[PDB]
Amino acid sequence: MTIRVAINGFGRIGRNFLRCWFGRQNTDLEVVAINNTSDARTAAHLLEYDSVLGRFNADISYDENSITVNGKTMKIVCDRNPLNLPWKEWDIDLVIESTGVFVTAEGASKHIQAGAKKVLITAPGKAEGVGTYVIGVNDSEYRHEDFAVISNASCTTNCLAPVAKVLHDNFGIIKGTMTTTHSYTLDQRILDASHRDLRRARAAAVNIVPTTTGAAKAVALVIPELKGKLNGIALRVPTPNVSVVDLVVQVEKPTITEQVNEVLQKASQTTMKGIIKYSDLPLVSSDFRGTDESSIVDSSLTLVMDGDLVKVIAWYDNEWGYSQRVVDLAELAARKSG
Amino acid sequence: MTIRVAINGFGRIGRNFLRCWFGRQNTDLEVVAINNTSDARTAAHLLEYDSVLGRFNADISYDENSITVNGKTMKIVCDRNPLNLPWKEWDIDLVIESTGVFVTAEGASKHIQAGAKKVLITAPGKAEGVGTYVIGVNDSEYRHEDFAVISNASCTTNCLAPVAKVLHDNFGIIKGTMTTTHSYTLDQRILDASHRDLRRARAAAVNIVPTTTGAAKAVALVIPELKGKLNGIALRVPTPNVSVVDLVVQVEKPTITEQVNEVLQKASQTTMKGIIKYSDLPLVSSDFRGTDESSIVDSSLTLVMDGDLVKVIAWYDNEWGYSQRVVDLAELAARKSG
Amino acid sequence: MTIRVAINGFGRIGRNFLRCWFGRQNTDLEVVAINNTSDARTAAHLLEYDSVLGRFNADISYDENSITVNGKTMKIVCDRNPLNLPWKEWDIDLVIESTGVFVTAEGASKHIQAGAKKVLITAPGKAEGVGTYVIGVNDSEYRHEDFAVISNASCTTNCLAPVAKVLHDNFGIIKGTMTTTHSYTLDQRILDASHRDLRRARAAAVNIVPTTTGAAKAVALVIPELKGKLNGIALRVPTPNVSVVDLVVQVEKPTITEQVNEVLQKASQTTMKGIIKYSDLPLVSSDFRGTDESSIVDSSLTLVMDGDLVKVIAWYDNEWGYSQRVVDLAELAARKSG
Amino acid sequence: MTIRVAINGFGRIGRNFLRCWFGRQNTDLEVVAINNTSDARTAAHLLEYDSVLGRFNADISYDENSITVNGKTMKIVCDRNPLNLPWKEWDIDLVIESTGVFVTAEGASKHIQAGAKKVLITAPGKAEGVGTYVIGVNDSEYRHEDFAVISNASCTTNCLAPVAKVLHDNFGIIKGTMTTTHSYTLDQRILDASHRDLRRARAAAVNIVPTTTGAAKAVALVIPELKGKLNGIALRVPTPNVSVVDLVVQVEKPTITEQVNEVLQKASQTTMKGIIKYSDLPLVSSDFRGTDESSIVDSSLTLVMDGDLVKVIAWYDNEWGYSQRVVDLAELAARKSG
Numbered sequence A, B, C, D: 001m002t003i004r005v006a007i008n009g010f011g012r013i014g015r016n017f018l019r020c021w022f023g024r025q026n027t028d029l030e031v032v033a034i035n036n037t038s039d040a041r042t043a044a045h046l047l048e049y050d051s052v053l054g055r056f057n058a059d060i061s062y063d064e065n066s067i068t069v070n071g072k073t074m075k076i077v078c079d080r081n082p083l084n085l086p087w088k089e090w091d092i093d094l095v096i097e098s099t100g101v102f103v104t105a106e107g108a109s110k111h112i113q114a115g116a117k118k119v120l121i122t123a124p125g126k127a128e129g130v131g132t133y134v135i136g137v138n139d140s141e142y143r144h145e146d147f148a149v150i151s152n153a154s155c156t157t158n159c160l161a162p163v164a165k166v167l168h169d170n171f172g173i174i175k176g177t178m179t180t181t182h183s184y185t186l187d188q189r190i191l192d193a194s195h196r197d198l199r200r201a202r203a204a205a206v207n208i209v210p211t212t213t214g215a216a217k218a219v220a221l222v223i224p225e226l227k228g229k230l231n232g233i234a235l236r237v238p239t240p241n242v243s244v245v246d247l248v249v250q251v252e253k254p255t256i257t258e259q260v261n262e263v264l265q266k267a268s269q270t271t272m273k274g275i276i277k278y279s280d281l282p283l284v285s286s287d288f289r290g291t292d293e294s295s296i297v298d299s300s301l302t303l304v305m306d307g308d309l310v311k312v313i314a315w316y317d318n319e320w321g322y323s324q325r326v327v328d329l330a331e332l333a334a335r336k337s338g
């Protein structure tokens, strides 16, 4: 039926998640609270005007400590300490952790101590303790009691995994490598400034910047048969949104370009309907802004070297597509609370 | 002689100041310490590799708590609290305040309490108490004991002031307005994120963003006769460095384009030699990267409407040009300690 | 009732005009043909996928020599010589000249020789012979027989004129100056390459580039009382669309910021309803993508120096807003053919 | 000795080649003429001011039909038809074909018909007939009389080939794939405009744009043993210069990361000295502007999956690095005319 949801960290994913939610047909979610760093005024304003999604077409208003959208009112709070949040009193079942700062089991659990029952990290979990799910890959393995702290993995892993599942099922992945040409994010710097990563420290809009990614190793979390078989890197480039994955895998079953495309397209219409979009048009990155699928296979770019070495390129709106999946995963949690 | 200087905040201006210094012919400054937020390693790395200035061609090395450039060793320390700094013990005479967080007389003076004798804010001073100087405009009014907390004003004010002086001296400014088309800075956000200023909160590299500026009112600090006579706004645009000033003034002495140019040039060769550069080539913004002058008059763009309404456009490398001036001001202070 | 229209030059304005047209309530236009440089395939594809407007939500298809949108079919032709166009045979009443290459009376008239009755240049006319109109400023002065070749002026003039009309009517413009911070266009170069204008020759996305504008002088065409009273320059900056006008005028009737705003807002709700949008929100350039008005006054930026020197900043979507006006002007022509 | 050279097409590569040349220690080339599309004035102006390279520090002057750089005078001519060129009369030995329009044996040979003896295409040759050389890979196979039309291949092939040679020599390449994340070029469009390639038609600075590349198949031209063994695609991204190659190869001799790096470095100090630069610093794209090497191995990004699947990432200044190689190839030809 319905679970009460609160969003912690009203940033890119936070606001994207909200909009996705409001565009949904039906839902078992009731967003009742938002925890942010600024005021209610700033939350309503950044929710309405988005440099990438454009203006949110909806009735948006706000007051000293809440925001209202199309009639639904959501309390606004602002505590940098999750432990101080009124989750218990507000009867919060599920908190969407999208602050980027409570990604460990303990960290994210501070919301449990504060009263919530389950928390969903909109990012990879760090350390042990969190269950990871990727809609369309291991979602049938979701059990309510497994973890109070779950993760929807990263945007890159959500694009990568579905395609890896289809590629592995039909040809058998022996080993593979991947590179993601990714839009810059708020974790990078607009101009040269210190950062734990000497590369993300550099002016994002004027540099192609290499950076590590755990996305390839992470698919093992949702497709255990691929443990230690994949890896790769990331290249952050000067675009504000949408990215693309370049996956190269040595396959076990010799095949041909027309065929890997055939199965990927087959899957986009059936088993990965809604998860994998099959695009055979000569399109560019900004053409996928707002696409709901987690992986957008660009068919005309598929390539097979000597029968067993395949390359597939898949696009993804790392903000919106991902948020659609975190919505799906929350909805999945809803369809089985306690 | 020589005064002992320490840099607080090793950011853009901080590192720009250091490179400017090392490129200088002679100096009365001895930079002996740098207080930054990260480690010595990151400082040496961002000092050498710059996305805008390019590689710093010099012998740069570092250890756990110092960095060495061309044989001169500089201690590295990292305290977010200026009150904890060993200024007294390191015999610090002048501190360059380039953190962007201690811009009030009180704030900056924390350095004084910690032992420094004079502090120079590489930005406008907020509130009462700081002395303000713009090289080439009011530097002859510099007296060592007037203020322990001095300010070199903003980059925009340093470009605007020298041009205002020349225009006012020669035609008499009645009132005027200015707009600066400015490159973005680290005070802006790469993607839509909260900010005190809802406009600076919006993704910098994909927006033209309007923001307020105190630069026009501030020239009064250095040309008192212009108090209440100037005003303006700023438009941040997607370039990482160099900006341009659009100054429109109603003048008292009717004049003509050829003449305002004639006097601006005259000044660039004489009274403003080194402060104002006279450019009559059809150039664009990146052609001014690394220019030492505070103001670069684009002559072919000078315009005079009906004899008393003049418009002059002046470029400026907001990082490098400005940093050259703070070196000049630190040197000015040096040539008169006590 | 209905006039037959053909678009010559299916570029930015060309495709923008078409989409605007298809979004209109009612119309007296029937677009029946498109003359482009490439094939029908390329026309349908660039009409559907736009890096700035996003995907055109409509039924779009094409064949060897035509394109169909939501049932309406439009013949595709491709002749670099207007004189070779089948206007007479296709019974073309009005041709939308948006190739950027037939902007003179003679040039644009080649379409008349080829059979069309009236041609509308989506840009300033060059030389003598063309009538210029700016919806909301001099449209009541439109007579069918005045010119077979008309012009909708430029995007900058359409933003500037409405505001100048309101400002002049209520306070009397003595003289003024203007600067437009404008998105780059296909007339500029992505990288340093030759151009008649040594400044537009320079890499557009990495430079702020000064360039001349005739927009200020042009308002005299639609507001003759302002002949020789205005002028200005342009600054092309790294954004793909939407620009902003900065107008400074010496006024005859002393006034105050609150008041010029009051009249501008008054006009946005009445005499300039649909032409001037009054925005008092702290917004940025990409927030106006797709705005229909020709001028968007940013109120919080309005400024008045010493009572008679005013500055108003107005935004405009130089592609879409402008195209909405060329649609309006074609519709106006329609409401009075012969 | 010395051969008389003429530059056809004074664009990016054209001007880059000229600056590279002037910076060279000794030469066997004498550049005596430049054929461009605009006037001598525009050539001198774009030669001096570069948005990417910065100001050319040299004595540059020009007149109605020549330009002089550091005392060497070069005639300027402007014919779009190579067949009209005074090559015979100016005793031209070698023409540098950098227009990007005469890339077939026949096309380029128009220069030969006009009097030149050998022509060097600064791009891949299209169709049969041209000899291809990549300095450091197959330059010892250069024989003066093999071809009158030679090619220095593409920038991507020049970065890919030296790395392929080293990897193939040491581990044996069975098959492989590569993707180049490339800065945009003048063959791309600033805003959505028609193009033979519907993807290159889309606004370059606001899109990640997929495009085909012949670079991988082309290394076979210079390392025959790799015919049919490599393949790939390109992704154009919003930076104006420097690109990176992502090469994944299935190797015959199992190896480890430390080892592929060990051999790549070994080569950078010996057999590929000056062709391959070994970079083990955490740098980003703009840090490689102005690098002379054809390939810049980013060691920390080297990756080896299960011993026989290697990935190496190599940067390259697609304009400057490439131009240094065409100077090298022109010099190679010079050291063996007839």
Ligand SMILES: NC(=O)c1ccc[n+]([C@@H]2O[C@H](COP(=O)([O-])OP(=O)(O)OC[C@H]3O[C@@H](n4cnc5c(N)ncnc54)[C@H](OP(=O)(O)O)[C@@H]3O)[C@@H](O)[C@H]2O)c1
Pocket (backbone or CB within 6 Å): A008, A009, A010, A011, A012, A013, A014, A035, A036, A037, A038, A079, A080, A081, A098, A099, A100, A101, A103, A122, A123, A153, A154, A155, A185, A186, A318, A319, A322, B192, B193, B194
């Ligand atoms: N961007 C993407 O494409 C993407 C894709 C997949 C996963 N993610 C993941 O999503 C998470 C959020 O990233 P984002 O891109 O949306 O960045 P973001 O816009 O910075 O969002 C994080 C939001 O949380 C707020 N915040 C930080 N610490 C907080 C605290 N202690 N309490 C309450 N709010 C706090 C931030 O406030 P201030 O900013 O004001 O400090 C900001 O509003 C990260 O873990 C990231 O890796 C992002």
Ligand SMILES: NC(=O)c1ccc[n+]([C@@H]2O[C@H](COP(=O)([O-])OP(=O)(O)OC[C@H]3O[C@@H](n4cnc5c(N)ncnc54)[C@H](OP(=O)(O)O)[C@@H]3O)[C@@H](O)[C@H]2O)c1
Pocket (backbone or CB within 6 Å): A192, A193, A194, B008, B009, B010, B011, B012, B013, B014, B035, B036, B037, B038, B079, B080, B081, B098, B099, B100, B101, B103, B122, B123, B154, B155, B185, B186, B318, B319, B322
């Ligand atoms: N950009 C320009 O062109 C320009 C021109 C004129 C004046 N300014 C002014 O110069 C100042 C510095 O700006 P910027 O552009 O150089 O920005 P910035 O690069 O962020 O520089 C500020 C530096 O201070 C450090 N910092 C922050 N808090 C600190 C603290 N409590 N203690 C010690 N160091 C601290 C920062 O470290 P973290 O970043 O790691 O926190 C960074 O290294 C500002 O007042 C600005 O208005 C800038």
Ligand SMILES: NC(=O)c1ccc[n+]([C@@H]2O[C@H](COP(=O)([O-])OP(=O)(O)OC[C@H]3O[C@@H](n4cnc5c(N)ncnc54)[C@H](OP(=O)(O)O)[C@@H]3O)[C@@H](O)[C@H]2O)c1
Pocket (backbone or CB within 6 Å): C008, C009, C010, C011, C012, C013, C014, C035, C036, C037, C038, C079, C080, C081, C098, C099, C100, C101, C103, C122, C123, C153, C154, C155, C185, C186, C318, C319, C322, D192, D193, D194
């Ligand atoms: N961009 C703006 O914001 C804006 C605002 C106001 C006014 N305008 C004016 O609108 C006009 C069009 O500019 P635009 O920005 O839309 O540029 P554009 O996208 O280049 O559009 C011009 C279109 O006309 C085509 N064309 C050129 N010569 C032709 C010929 N002889 N016959 C048939 N088609 C021809 C071009 O083909 P190819 O490109 O394939 O050669 C292109 O498709 C210009 O006069 C401009 O000043 C533009």
Ligand SMILES: NC(=O)c1ccc[n+]([C@@H]2O[C@H](COP(=O)([O-])OP(=O)(O)OC[C@H]3O[C@@H](n4cnc5c(N)ncnc54)[C@H](OP(=O)(O)O)[C@@H]3O)[C@@H](O)[C@H]2O)c1
Pocket (backbone or CB within 6 Å): C192, C193, C194, D008, D009, D010, D011, D012, D013, D014, D035, D036, D037, D038, D079, D080, D081, D098, D099, D100, D101, D103, D122, D123, D154, D155, D185, D186, D318, D319, D322
């Ligand atoms: N960009 C790179 O990094 C790179 C690297 C390796 C190879 N290349 C190759 O180098 C070649 C040149 O490309 P580019 O990037 O330098 O582009 P570009 O700057 O456009 O250079 C071509 C030059 O040739 C001129 N031109 C065009 N048609 C001509 C004709 N009929 N006769 C004489 N001159 C003519 C152009 O003038 P107008 O522009 O005024 O028409 C321009 O000066 C291409 O084959 C390209 O694939 C480029």
